[PDB]
């Protein structure tokens, strides 16, 4: 390597995890609940209708 201080490669891999983790949390919450919407962080039109 060339840099002894910071590993921005691990930083990029770290950024990769959280975006998948959000969809992960959505998936478990949707499996547990009977409803797909479930207090819509997504479109509110579906929840209202």
């Amino acid at each position: 390597a060339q840099v002894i201080n910071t590993n921005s490669l691990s930083l990029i891999t770290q950024n990769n995890i959280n975006k998948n983790q959000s969809a992960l949390s959505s998936s478990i919450e949707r499996l547990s609940s009977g409803l797909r919407i479930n207090s819509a962080k997504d479109d509110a039109a579906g929840q209202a209708i």
Binding site: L24, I28, L31, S32, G34
Partner: protein, 48 residues
């Protein structure tokens, strides 16, 4: 008599589906909780 029975009656065919639905949701919740409890586990190999 028929009026009072109609006003409050179990009407089995309706709530049988409800109880089956509730049991299915409960089992699904237990399964998904068992699948989701493993999320913090991967940090162990990270340490050493």
């Amino acid at each position: 008599s028929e009026a009072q029975s109609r006003i409050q009656d179990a009407d089995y065919a309706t709530e049988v589906s409800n109880m089956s639905k509730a049991q299915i949701i409960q089992q699904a919740g237990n399964s998904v909780l068992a699948k989701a409890n493993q999320v913090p586990q991967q940090v162990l190999s990270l340490l050493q």
